[PDB]
């Protein structure tokens, strides 16, 4: 036997840090939960008990902590490719670093219409996410995305058309509810390191909130002619508003609210025009998957 | 052998509702999970096989779609109401009903500075729920909460004075973190029946409010002395607001970030006032509770 | 304002302790989750910023872990109350101690056809737990449990005979699947004090091993009339076996399991008779309640 | 823009399913969650709104349902690629289906030393999957894998030798417990089509069964230089025993039990020789991976 491949490291750590502006008392929090798994000349720890190779899960939470103490934070492609970078150059037998990065929302409060400097709240549990790979000689490959934002709209969605055969039972229809938690991923043309990445750094958030706010806008106001063609329209948009992206990738489940059917009482009408109580299905649900490139 | 006590029904109800302005074209949805337990002249169901006792949970559930398609699911305390108020009046042999009702957010759509007309966003898994007793012959009581409302501050919170022995190792602190999941609940009076709640419909909106105001504002602007003096605040604030309610209850986990000393480390300072990076603590967690009442 | 009721503590507290034999080299493992939650003279901390009354939780955390250090931790009722009594005998103005303890499954691995002297299994998620409050001069009250265990029976299960209304659609059944996920509760006569506890040890696990054996048994062997009948039928048992319970709790979902029609398809027939493939539902579920005590 | 790839179909599908022996009465049951995605020449259902292409996601699900109706479920390898065979061959547009399974736990009760015919109990939630990419041209690639299988040795565990810098804190030991919850990936040789998955229905369970006894028995009995040397061994005797897998795969997290010093507390010791009481942290989490394949 052999090893084909390996990586190892330490997931689900959890990092807080402040900014303090000592003029104005205003204080700005982020938290994260990093996970860093290293890729290099480690096979012998596998295979012969060799842990001198090893450098140890515990000090990759350690140097999460030292990185983080020593750099911004944000944006976390930014943190991502420096604490990667750190890994690569500072261990001669370690080749790749694979950052994964969740970014925990703490919105600063507004109390009695002003923004408070130092009180946050968690609004929704969608996260900013990056997954910045680095690996020696090829460079830093970052992919960037929002979850966890999951949205309603009570009409304008419509699925009609679609193939009929003997497996069909669903009805055609022009006026349905469509929620979905968004998934979306924009992927990063290669950068060769980490003085690449640091000369793009506000495009990281300009392209985030692009992405947030054409998912959102597009949401709303395209009648829907399925998951499908809605969300091709958000990738299209996204991919012609910042051209260092080579690709976006929307993963959308289709949270089906079901009508019901209440005419067995008393002739209750509650369909089609006159369907106002629906029953939200937690399972199955339909799950839609894309990447769109340059034509 | 004897049935001391029972009760039975359906739960994980989910439901959601639409109102639609055929003047406007504005739509406005309403998402919830309900569970209603009924008790009564039932024991017979549990000790002699009789279920000619038992309205069926299943029955329970088609019961809560058609009161949601005859009724207002808003205020969440007068459906729960109605709902209860239909099984004790309904079957003679059932004495009490029990609602519990979590709403979910689906928080109005902002597009381009202009509020949408039906797209719809879960800003948070904060819930807004009511516990409705309907007991014949003892009226309405009514338990009204938020929850899951996930907040931090980064300074203006204390912990010193606090008892110390041979047990204690907890140094004392003029400046840390505070975080937690504020649960609050506010004990209606008790309502003679529906009627009385339908009397008050206005003030389960307006409380929710309130409750809601003073726990940010509380949070954010008290110098914090201790959870225990700051939830305190808050409950003698929203006493003080309605008159209708007897009780203030909060439920508040201590949610620890740990400072981080990282001074083996080429003497970096991350403690005290040098304190910028530290460690979220899943568990443990204090948990500090409370019931303010009218002195 | 004044407090009404108030306590506070740790929640959360992941515990594990090993005994090792020394002679025989086996070793056994204990791992619970612990939270403390006291009650006294502390209001002063919640309305005068009086910290002074308050015993920390991280020193109640240290607390914890100081008592399974020097005392056994199995059972979970002895140990609660071990830990409970030291609060109310430490602390003048602590008056009650609530102790909760969920505790995880670790059994022994059979390697081989032999039991291992060190390695060990989560054989599913069920847990073993008690709720045991010491209160100053009303002696130690003990609620033991078992709850997460999941079965299900695919036949001799029955739901007929139920009342039927304009608000009934379900069908009677003569065979149908039931499936819950049993939660038991059997409570303790008051206890004076932490000697009578003692003098009680070998019963709780004797207790625990019965009521979970009644459970089983009567679920499979119970041709079943309704949950209520079959759940009542567990509990007299119980109640016939340990003359030092008072009483038996049961909370059992109904989770669910639907014919699916499939004769739209080729005349396929999967109901009644012919029922092989179901849809296990999700949402919603029957829940089903009692109290069970002696005549 | 341009699709440059696309999946979609219909995920979180429940399926039980009974066998019955009309002779003996024996029932056996049988439960899954499956997802079902197809890709094929499907494009224009994203950028011309065509939905005429489009199997609806609703249609999967039933045939999903009607599948396991007329074919058997187990192995679930079989089930999956029958499943898969069925979308590529019934649709000429679409090229691949890429079926995933989980089984849940349905373990026989024993009664009073005795299997009984029809109760089951879900003893834990490891899980066995499959992952089936069903490919036009390029046949069948199976994965199959058991996850969720939680352990814990008490000794024979060590981590010693590993590389020691400024970044590094964690002590040597020579004893320490390990923890993991085990995730397996046995990777099959590359199958033309149904047929030949039919033609090694035996080896599914075998290979299954071969894999967990393999793990446990080498958790056990292993001294423990490390995970990664650990997890090695299992893959190496997997790929011994079954000449039809290609790879094997492990994902290992070191669920961390941490000493705890109380020597602070009347010299109380706790660690090292000494160590009883530990506290099993939740986060972070060493996160250990390997593909092992043929030299
Ligand atoms: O938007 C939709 N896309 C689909 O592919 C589908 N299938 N069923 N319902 C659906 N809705
Ligand atoms: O606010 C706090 N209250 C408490 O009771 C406590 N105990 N430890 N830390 C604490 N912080
Ligand atoms: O056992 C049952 N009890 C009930 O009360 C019930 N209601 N619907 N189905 C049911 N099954
Ligand atoms: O088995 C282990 N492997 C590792 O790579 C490691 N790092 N810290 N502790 C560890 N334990
Ligand atoms: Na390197
Ligand atoms: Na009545
Ligand atoms: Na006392
Ligand atoms: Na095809």
Same mark, same amino acid.
Request: contains cysteine.
């Given at each position: 036997?052999?090893?084909?491949?390996?990586?190892? @490291? &330490?997931?689900?750590?959890?990092?807080?840090?402040?900014?303090?502006? %000592? /003029?104005?008392? +205003? *204080?700005?929090?982020?938290?994260?939960?990093?996970?860093?798994?290293?890729?290099?000349?480690?096979?012998?720890?596998?295979?012969?008990?060799?842990?001198?190779?090893?450098?140890?899960?515990?000090?990759?939470?350690?140097?999460?902590?030292?990185?983080?103490?020593?750099?911004?934070?944000?944006?976390?492609?930014?943190?991502?490719?420096?604490?990667?970078?750190?890994?690569?150059?500072?261990?001669?037998?370690?080749?790749?670093?694979?950052?994964?990065?969740?970014?925990?929302?703490?919105?600063?409060?507004?109390?009695? @219409? &002003?923004?408070?400097?130092?009180?946050?709240?968690?609004?929704?549990? %969608? /996260?900013?996410? +990056? *997954?910045?790979?680095?690996?020696?000689?090829?460079?830093?490959?970052?992919?960037?995305?929002?979850?966890?934002?999951?949205?309603?709209?009570?009409?304008?969605?419509?699925?009609?058309?679609?193939?009929?055969?003997?497996?069909?039972?669903?009805?055609?229809?022009?006026?349905?509810?469509?929620?979905?938690?968004?998934?979306?991923?924009?992927?990063?043309?290669?950068?060769?390191?980490?003085?690449?990445?640091?000369?793009?750094?506000?495009?990281?958030?300009?392209?985030?909130?692009?992405?947030?706010?054409?998912?959102?806008?597009?949401?709303?106001?395209?009648?829907?002619?399925?998951?499908?063609?809605?969300?091709?329209?958000?990738?299209?948009?996204?991919?012609?508003?910042?051209?260092?992206?080579?690709?976006?990738?929307?993963?959308?489940?289709?949270?089906?609210?079901?009508?019901?059917?209440?005419?067995?009482?008393?002739?209750?009408?509650?369909?089609?025009?006159?369907?106002?109580?629906?029953?939200?299905?937690?399972?199955?649900?339909?799950?839609?998957?894309?990447?769109?490139?340059?034509?």
């Amino acid at each position: 036997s052999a090893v084909k491949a390996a990586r190892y @490291g &330490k997931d689900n750590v959890r990092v807080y840090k402040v900014h303090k502006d %000592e /003029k104005t008392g +205003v *204080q700005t929090v982020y938290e994260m939960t990093v996970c860093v798994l290293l890729e290099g000349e480690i096979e012998t720890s596998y295979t012969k008990a060799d842990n001198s190779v090893i450098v140890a899960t515990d000090s990759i939470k350690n140097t999460i902590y030292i990185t983080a103490k020593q750099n911004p934070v944000t944006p976390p492609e930014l943190f991502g490719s420096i604490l990667g970078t750190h890994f690569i150059e500072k261990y001669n037998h370690i080749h790749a670093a694979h950052v994964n990065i969740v970014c925990h929302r703490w919105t600063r409060m507004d109390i009695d @219409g &002003k923004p408070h400097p130092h009180s946050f709240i968690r609004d929704s549990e %969608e /996260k900013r996410n +990056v *997954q910045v790979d680095v690996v020696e000689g090829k460079g830093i490959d970052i992919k960037s995305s929002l979850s966890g934002l999951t949205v309603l709209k009570s009409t304008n969605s419509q699925f009609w058309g679609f193939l009929r055969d003997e497996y069909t039972t669903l009805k055609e229809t022009w006026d349905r509810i469509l929620s979905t938690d968004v998934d979306a991923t924009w992927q990063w043309k290669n950068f060769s390191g980490l003085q690449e990445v640091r000369s793009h750094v506000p495009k990281f958030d300009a392209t985030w909130a692009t992405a947030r706010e054409v998912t959102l806008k597009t949401f709303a106001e395209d009648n829907s002619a399925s998951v499908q063609a809605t969300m091709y329209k958000m990738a299209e948009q996204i991919l012609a508003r910042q051209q260092l992206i080579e690709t976006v990738e929307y993963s959308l489940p289709n949270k089906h609210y079901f009508e019901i059917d209440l005419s067995w009482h008393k002739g209750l009408q509650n369909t089609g025009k006159n369907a106002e109580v629906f029953a939200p299905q937690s399972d199955p649900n339909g799950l839609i998957k894309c990447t769109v490139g340059r034509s």
